[PDB]
């Protein structure tokens, strides 16, 4: 575990339960909305259940429109 | 649009933008598509006993909708936030009565005030399907925390998946532990872990879920299968393999109940009796949810992206793919039925 | 405006006035400057608060000064503000499982609240993210009862609103006028090398300043820049210095004429340097660069510090063959260690100034990769997030004359990547994960699904980072995982 990663491995986000990356979504996009819809990894992946409900508006098809997913923190400027 | 045909087999799946699609199982092609009201999330659907109306948990886990598949008409709608000052969410927890006259849903509410939140105890809310688009609780009972999947048995009883699987009387609200999970004090083993959000309406007529459990970091990881026969109420569990990889969903073939197919990064075919992997298949990408047709002659892989993978269960090889209009299926559960 | 009127004009309505510029929730918590920015940011994102970046900066400053943390209350968890995301946290299990499985446990430790405020926080979590109690390390227990009955009282005990430290800090807190002046600095950027020079801090409006960095790296690449900085709570230094073509953020703790912290790229927090500075007016010996000398070797060594006066003595066996330059903040000389010099540390000195050690060594026995474990991340390729590099250094170890282990330092090495396991070989991670450069910098692959890979998967990988010393060919091993991006990235991890 690293300070910048999640410890909730279901199978996880930035490392799986086994400590590798194989049990993760392949590709990650296959398990993106499965992570986002019910906010399974809210600290890394933005919740659409409550906080960022229109996050994937321009990316309904994550396999092809993953580039349209923006960052969520309200940075200066 | 086109009304569904009698005797014909169909499959419903929900797609990202906010679609409900009907797939003609015989030709493996999209029969028709319906646009659902409001917003998507989770999009989990189940067919009513009429083989005509689909009930969907949508609008960010806070509303249930009834949609007539022959016309795409929104015939029912129950908001889960009927209590003043609270926002209610359903963690995939909803079921339809055997006669289709009531819908149940456990609501985990949160009172949202001006400068703070207060999490409130959960509650089962009963809705009458006759109430249409403004359905309100006709009955409510207290529910324990961490409740998710629920399925109404033939005798009207409701099997509730929570820390333990409960059997609940929907008239009195009293419930008993039907199958202990957390409090399954089985020696030599740990408590089982269950992560399941796919309420399969399988041909076998059972409420089934997969679980993992350690058999005594020394512990031997195993995969198990749990099942509640919805006809008789008979409960059953059994480990079928040593955990080598993960699977999200798993179904027993209606063709051969001794074979269980699990899926996530690979589609695996197991021998329950022998507790042995008979065959595995590599996928084009991660798939969440399995679905068998009535005869068990086909196996569909759904969830994740916008395509269904059609597999031949015997050879365990992808026959074709059904590309759905729109985007990701996400955590949707492919539902098969005969119109 | 002024902090108090903005508090009322922007927070009131939702937050109840309790008298003399105090409000519900707000006046009962103490956080770091980034902690305050995060709370206000949540108000905008979650509650629709309408506030300009300027008024937000005004409120953060006001709240950071009024309700901040004493220096000792940040002890051991400063890595979070310093954006050290590869830090392996060490907290008790209850805190880690309950509160540190999503974000860092440090985000919790950088706050002080009474039990009721810790309780409101627990209700907010389960209320904003209902799935919380159905997740790993939550579904296996009665999460809410445990959190309210066990965790809240512990959090209130470990991190209380009132403390002796906070009390004394409000009285002993210095003003910003104690910072202007010349500051000699020493530092080190992983996979790049040492850096040294002088930072000129001149005053500006209020608690803000103008900053001038004059210096260079050990290799000769310049480190000159200009920027500004603000000082929160009398010690929390936050600055931005445009050095070359990159904006570097400075997160230092300025205490007793000394600044300790980290300076990283605004956009890439894995690309940074450790930073230590000493204010002029006090004689200090900051660092020796390099901090090692091989027996029977010729080497240009430079001493960094403040008020350096006298003659440099590098210990027994080390010969100062010529002082190439001797200013009060930098003394670069040529040295020669005898082939006979006994291996071990040497107390270095400039006149009567002592403080830093120089390791004389004969041979390298053991090599350690630093960091031993880290996370690299795919990015760019059209994505909204940047790549997160793997940056490494080979730490050499030997033995001194007393048979005791000797940490020599960071020695030049050759870098390569190998599959970490049978799985990584099968999927060809070394071919897709990215490229390990000769300088120890690993550049991950681009983001998105990769049609070329099995299951069109991402350019992720499970790698073994191998360093082989140029001095003797002794190898070392590290572990690096190249993973997916994260779109939610607040000021604190
Ligand atoms: C133990 C019960 C926990 C404590 C104590 C805290 N958390 Fe969390 N947390 C989570 C998110 C998604 C956020 C903020 C949104 C974002 O990061 O983008 C937070 C935030 C906090 C904060 C900041 C509070 C503020 O600014 O007012 C504190 C002090 C905090 N958390 C304490 C997510 C999660 C989560 C995953 C589902 C868990 C288990 C926890 N947090 C647990 C704790
Ligand atoms: C109404 C729409 C709000 C305005 C305007 C502001 N806040 Fe708020 N705040 C609001 C709620 C409903 C809550 C409770 C739930 C939550 O998000 O935490 C809060 C809470 C806070 C807190 C406590 C945070 C914690 O983790 O305990 C703080 C410190 C806070 N609010 C600060 C704050 C400030 C400084 C505001 C002025 C710019 C402000 N809030 C406005 C709702 C609303
Ligand atoms: N960690 N991701 C994840 C996606 C989907 C489900 N699920 O559908 O139950 C669970 C976890
Ligand atoms: Ni070694």
CA distance B175 to chain C (A): 19
DSSP A29: G
CA distance C126 to C377: 29
- Map residue C287 onto helix, strand or coil: strand
Token output for C434: 């990215």
Residues of A in contact with C421 (CB under 8 A): 20
- Residue B143: which of B157, B163, B117, B127 has the closest Cα? B163
Find out whether the peptide bond into A27 is cis, omega within 30 degrees of 0. Answer: yes
Q: Do residues C360 and C318 make contact, with C-beta atoms less than 8 angstroms apart?
A: yes
Question: Using the beta-carbon criterion (under 8 Å), do C457 and A26 form an inter-chain contact?
Answer: yes
CA distance C67 to C58: 14
Q: Do residues B305 and B285 make contact, with C-beta atoms less than 8 angstroms apart?
A: yes
DSSP H/E element including B141: strand B139-142
C9 and A CB contact within 8 Å? no
- Residue A59: which of B321, C129, C381, C383 has the closest Cα? C383
CA distance C299 to C182: 29
Starting from the CA of residue C127, give the closest ligand.
2
* DSSP per-residue string spanning C12-74: BTTB-EEETTEETTGGG-EE-HHHHHHHHHHHHHHH-----HHHHHHHHHHHHHHT---GGGS
C48 and B CB contact within 8 Å? no
DSSP H/E element including C430: helix C429-432
Please give the distance, rounded to the nearest whole angstrom, from the Cα atom of residue C97 to the centre of ligand 2.
Answer: 26
DSSP H/E element including B13: strand B9-15
Burial B143-177, CB ≥16 within 10 A → b, else e? bebbbbbbbbbeeebbbbbbbbbbbbebeeeebee
Question: Using the beta-carbon criterion (under 8 Å), do B60 and A50 form an inter-chain contact?
Answer: yes
Give Cα C173 to chain centroid, integer Å: 24
Name the resolution in angstroms: 2.0
- A31 has catalytic annotation: yes
Q: What angle do CA B138, B107, B43 make, to 5 degrees?
A: 105
Instruction: Point out the ligand 1 atom lying closest to the alpha carbon of residue C118.
Output: 5
DSSP H/E element including A52: none
Starting from the CA of residue B303, give the closest ligand.
3
Place of tokens 């930073």: C275
Residue in B108, B146, B286 closest to C139 by CB: B146
Structure determination method: X-ray
CA distance C259 to C209: 15
Q: Do residues A46 and A38 make contact, with C-beta atoms less than 8 angstroms apart?
A: no
Domain count within chain B: 1
Residues comprising chain C, all counted: 493
DSSP C382: T
Q: Is the CB of C417 under 6 A from ligand 2?
A: no
- Map residue B186 onto helix, strand or coil: coil
Q: Which residues between 277 and 316 in chain B have a beta carbon less than 8 angstroms from any beta carbon of chain C? A: 282-286
Preferred mutation among A27, A37, A40, A47 to probe C, highest tally of C CBs within 10 A? A27
Preferred mutation among C136, C379, C386 to probe A, highest tally of A CBs within 10 A? C136
- Map residue C97 onto helix, strand or coil: helix
A34 and B CB contact within 8 Å? yes
Token output for B233: 């109420």
Class of CATH domain A1-77: few secondary structures
From residue C397, alpha-carbon distances to A61, B173, C132, C364, C371 in Å are: 52, 69, 46, 6, 15
Question: Using the beta-carbon criterion (under 8 Å), do B148 and C143 form an inter-chain contact?
Answer: no
- Residue A60: which of C382, C489, B40 has the closest Cα? B40
Range of the domain at B123: 1-339
* CATH number of the domain where residue B107 is located: 2.130.10.10
Q: Do residues C417 and C430 make contact, with C-beta atoms less than 8 angstroms apart?
A: yes
Residue in C427, C455, C489 closest to A71 by CB: C489
Q: Is C202 left (phi over 0), alpha (psi -120 to 50) or beta?
A: beta
- Residue C59: which of C67, C70, C48 has the closest Cα? C67
Which residue positions of C form the known binding site for heme c? 11, 14-15, 25, 29, 31, 39, 42-43, 47, 99, 102-103, 107, 113, 125, 488
Nearest-CA residue of chain B relative to A53?
B60
DSSP H/E element including B267: strand B266-271
- Residue C419: which of C482, C377, C485 has the closest Cα? C482
CA distance B154 to chain A (A): 30
Chains A, C: CB contacts under 8 A, how many? Answer: 158
* DSSP per-residue string spanning C288-306: EESSEEETTEEEEEEEEEE
Instruction: Point out the ligand 2 atom lying closest to the alpha carbon of residue C49.
Output: 5
* DSSP per-residue string spanning B105-138: EEEEEEEE-SS-EEE---EEEEEEGGGGGGB--S
| Beta carbons within 10 angstroms of residue B298's beta carbon | 20
Burial class (CB in 10 A: 0-12, 13-18, 19+), B134: exposed
What domains can be seen in chain C, in order of their start residue?
Answer: 1-173 (no CATH), 174-282 (2.40.128.120), 283-362 (2.60.40.10), 363-485 (2.60.40.10)
Residues comprising chain A, all counted: 77
Which residues, judged by CB distance below 6 Å to any ligand atom, belong to the binding site of ligand 3? A 10, 31, 34-35, 40; B 195, 197, 288, 331
Token output for B61: 């886990």
Place of tokens 């953020």: C249
- Residue C331: which of C340, C320, C339, C341 has the closest Cα? C320
Residues comprising chain B, all counted: 339
From residue B169, alpha-carbon distances to B143, B149, C178, C290, C380 in Å are: 12, 16, 73, 77, 55
Place of tokens 């026969």: B229
């Amino acid at each position: 575990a690293v300070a910048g990663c999640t410890a909730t491995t279901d199978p996880g986000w930035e490392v799986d339960a086994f400590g590798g990356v194989s049990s993760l979504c392949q590709p990650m996009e296959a398990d993106l909305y499965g992570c986002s819809d019910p906010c399974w990894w809210p600290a890394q992946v933005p919740d659409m259940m409550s906080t960022y409900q229109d996050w994937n508006a321009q990316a309904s098809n994550s396999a092809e429109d993953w580039r349209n997913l923006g960052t969520v923190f309200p940075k200066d400027k | 649009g086109p009304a569904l045909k009698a005797g014909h087999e169909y499959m419903i799946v929900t797609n990202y933008p906010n679609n409900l699609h009907v797939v003609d199982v015989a030709s493996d092609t999209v029969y028709k598509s319906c646009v659902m009201p409001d917003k998507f999330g989770p999009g989990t659907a189940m067919m009513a006993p009429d083989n005509r109306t689909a009930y969907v948990l949508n609008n960010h886990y806070g509303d249930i909708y009834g949609i007539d598949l022959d016309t795409c008409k929104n015939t029912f709608h129950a908001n889960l936030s009927s209590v003043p000052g609270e926002v209610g969410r359903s963690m995939y927890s909803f079921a339809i009565s055997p006669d289709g006259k009531e819908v149940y849903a456990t609501v985990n509410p949160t009172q949202r005030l001006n400068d703070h939140y207060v999490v409130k105890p959960p509650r089962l809310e009963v809705f009458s399907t006759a109430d249409g688009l403004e359905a309100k609780p006709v009955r409510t009972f207290p529910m324990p925390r961490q409740v998710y999947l629920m399925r109404a048995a033939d005798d009207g009883s409701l099997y509730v998946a929570g820390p333990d699987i409960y059997k609940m009387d929907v008239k009195t609200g009293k419930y008993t532990v039907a199958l202990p999970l957390r409090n399954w004090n089985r020696k030599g083993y740990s408590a089982p872990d269950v992560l399941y959000f796919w309420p399969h309406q399988s041909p076998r007529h059972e409420f089934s879920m997969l679980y993992t459990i350690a058999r005594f970091a020394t512990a031997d990881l195993l995969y198990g299968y749990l099942s509640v026969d919805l006809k008789t109420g008979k409960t059953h569990t059994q480990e079928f393999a040593d955990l080598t990889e993960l699977y999200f969903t798993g179904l027993r073939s209606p063709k051969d109940p001794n074979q269980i197919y699990g899926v996530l990064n690979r589609l695996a075919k197991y021998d329950l009796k022998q507790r042995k992997l008979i065959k595995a298949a590599n996928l084009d990408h991660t798939y969440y949810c399995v679905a068998f047709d009535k005869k068990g002659d086909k196996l569909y892989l759904g969830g994740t992206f916008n395509d269904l993978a059609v597999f031949n269960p015997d050879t365990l090889e992808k026959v074709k793919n059904i590309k759905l209009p729109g985007g990701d299926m996400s955590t949707t559960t492919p539902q098969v039925f005969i119109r | 405006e002024q902090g108090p009127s903005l508090l009322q004009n922007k927070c009131m309505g939702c937050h109840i006035p309790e008298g003399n510029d105090t409000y519900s929730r707000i006046s009962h918590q103490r956080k770091t400057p980034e902690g305050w920015l995060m709370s206000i940011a949540r108000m905008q994102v979650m509650h629709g608060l309408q506030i300009s970046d300027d008024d937000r900066r005004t409120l953060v400053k006001y709240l950071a000064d009024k309700q901040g943390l004493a220096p000792s209350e940040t002890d051991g968890v400063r890595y979070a503000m310093e954006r050290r995301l590869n830090t392996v946290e060490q907290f008790d299990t209850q805190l880690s499982e309950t509160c540190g499985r999503c974000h860092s446990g440090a985000r919790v430790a950088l706050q002080r609240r009474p039990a009721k405020e810790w309780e409101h926080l627990v209700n907010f979590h389960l209320g904003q993210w209902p799935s919380l109690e159905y997740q790993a390390q939550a579904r296996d227990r009665d999460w809410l009862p445990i959190a309210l009955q066990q965790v809240v009282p512990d959090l209130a005990k470990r991190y209380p609103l009132e403390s002796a430290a906070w009390a004394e800090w409000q009285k002993a807190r210095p003003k910003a006028d104690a910072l202007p002046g010349q500051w000699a600095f020493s530092g080190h950027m992983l996979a790049k090398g040492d850096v040294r020079g002088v930072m000129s801090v001149t005053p500006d409006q209020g608690d803000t300043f103008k900053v001038e960095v004059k210096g260079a790296y050990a290799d000769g690449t310049p480190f000159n820049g200009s920027g500004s900085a603000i000082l929160y709570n009398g010690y929390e230094w936050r600055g931005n210095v445009k050095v070359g073509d990159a904006n570097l953020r400075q997160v230092f703790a300025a205490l007793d004429g000394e600044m300790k912290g980290r300076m990283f790229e605004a956009e890439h927090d894995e690309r940074g340097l450790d930073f230590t500075a000493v204010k002029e007016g006090k004689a200090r010996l900051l660092a020796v660069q390099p901090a090692f000398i091989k027996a029977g070797g010729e080497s240009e060594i430079t001493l960094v510090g403040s008020g350096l006066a006298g003659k440099p003595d590098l210990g027994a066996g080390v010969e100062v063959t010529e002082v190439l330059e001797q200013t009060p903040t930098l003394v670069r000389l040529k040295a020669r260690a005898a082939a006979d010099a006994k291996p071990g540390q040497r107390e270095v000195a400039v006149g009567t100034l002592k403080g830093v050690n120089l390791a004389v060594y004969d041979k390298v026995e053991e090599v350690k990769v630093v960091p031993a474990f880290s996370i690299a991340r795919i990015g760019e390729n059209g994505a909204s997030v940047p790549k997160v590099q793997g940056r490494f250094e080979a730490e050499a170890w030997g033995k001194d004359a007393n048979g005791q282990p000797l940490r020599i330092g960071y020695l030049p090495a050759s870098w390569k990547v190998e599959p970490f396991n049978e799985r990584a070989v099968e999927d060809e991670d070394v071919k897709f994960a990215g490229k390990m450069q000769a300088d120890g910098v690993f550049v991950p692959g681009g983001a998105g699904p990769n049609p070329e890979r099995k299951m069109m998967t991402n350019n992720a990988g499970n790698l073994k980072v191998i360093a082989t010393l140029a001095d003797g060919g002794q190898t070392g091993e590290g572990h690096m995982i190249v993973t997916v991006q994260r779109w939610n990235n607040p000021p604190l991890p």
